[PDB]
Amino acid sequence: WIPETLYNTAISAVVDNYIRSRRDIRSLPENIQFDVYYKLYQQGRLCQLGSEFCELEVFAKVLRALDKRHLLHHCFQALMDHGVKVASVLAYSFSRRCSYIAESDAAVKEKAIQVGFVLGGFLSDAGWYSDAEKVFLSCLQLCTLHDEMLHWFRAVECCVRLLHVRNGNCKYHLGEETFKLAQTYMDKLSKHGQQANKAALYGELCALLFAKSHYDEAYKWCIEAMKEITAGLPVKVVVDVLRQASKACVVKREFKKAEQLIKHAVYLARDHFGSKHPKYSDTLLDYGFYLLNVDNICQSVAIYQAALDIRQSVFGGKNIHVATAHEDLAYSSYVHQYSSGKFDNALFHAERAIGIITHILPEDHLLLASSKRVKALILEEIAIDCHNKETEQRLLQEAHDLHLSSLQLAKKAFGEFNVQTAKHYGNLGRLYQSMRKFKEAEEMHIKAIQIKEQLLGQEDYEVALSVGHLASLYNYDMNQYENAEKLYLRSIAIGKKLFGEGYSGLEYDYRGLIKLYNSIGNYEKVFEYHNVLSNWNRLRDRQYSVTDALEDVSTSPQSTEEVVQSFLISQ
């Protein structure tokens, strides 16, 4: 075997006498300190490593190793699984040093901000948004004092990041005032004869308003963000703006326009960052979102699992980013295997997401509600596909508890007249249909349809799903056939208008319509709908021949200017 490097041998020999050289490792060159601490992690000395990474003196010299940063993202995660609250301790140490340094000159305070920017960016990359927000709040407090142009530029650069850490933590009410403050600093900086590139801020506001289910405002602000993309922007900012604009276009029924945006975002992420980077994982996750919302589910699982494997290898175990990848892949495997009933893998991913989130986030957090709702959806179909009625009454009761928790969280945060609570009402209607509570299921589905028609137009994907649910409740169970006829027709119209004739839910809609017309006496229509369903199945079998979504982007498809200009000229 090849001999071990003298660098690695000396690292092994300096770790071993760790107490005799603990204070001397901190005086090593900054690229040897991280290697020594990575040897501490590799040796299993997590207890000795936690006492070193909890000091901002030591962690600052570790954050400046950028090649081996993906290694640190694992080590810093392991300590947070080890029980060492490294993120909160580092945020508290930074806040303390900011309090001690606020009464000093602007030259030294700027260096404390730059240490703050990299630390806060690391904590927001790692997913500790509750602890990255403290660091960015301290940086904003440092920038607030002096009113010169440099301090205003640093303050807007920390408010385009404070908005990001208040969106991953689901604090949109604080996010609105953060964007207001960033806009105030931008206006003040513009009044002093200088312009700041407001692409990252508008992209973060697009993410906030899409997460708040304000798809019209989200689309407007993503258009305004894409107007501000230049050539000199960092690749991270361009990727984030492309990704959020793609999500806004998808939820605004612009699948032909979001395709190029998200494919170019994925290309940029795989080109600059690489195939094993958390930003590439984020782009893959939202690419899977786009593919899942364009009835391309058969490969969406192939994209979330690619996104999860990147996040689970870089971010270790109990991380919110791994939890988000799990709760997203659990919902795709729920959809991809809805016609197969093999939800064992989908349930495995769904209970893994809640197992992570309940450990690291409080019980009163929105991001727990989405994980609970996916597991509740999977438990619905497992209950209706088993045989024991005790299981059918236990799984459905657990799903009821999960949906009530999700509904109360979304109602407390978003409100009553939003879209997330509307689809929670739709899911409650589905669950009550499964629980033979047909009157309350009808009430829930009527509420969901009312809220979604009030907001999401009249021919949208979500209102189509809710209409299909209510119509299946009327037809298959409540036997109100004349009411279900118009709802089937509207669902067919929306599905054909949006996704064409290849929509997956068209199968369930056609089957319900066939039974509807069979139980009323329109038998020739029943036969014509059998042959329509056969044509649909043949068309879906033909459409099954689609290559993997990671090969559609190919190598160098377009560039940023072409895609941005195409989106801009396309309204």
């Binding site: 809805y338 689809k423 799903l465 299909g468 299946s472 839910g505 089957r511």
Partner: peptide, 9 residues
């Protein structure tokens, strides 16, 4: 399979 799928995550 009397129903459709669930809305969003």
């Amino acid at each position: 399979l009397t129903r459709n799928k669930g809305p969003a995550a």
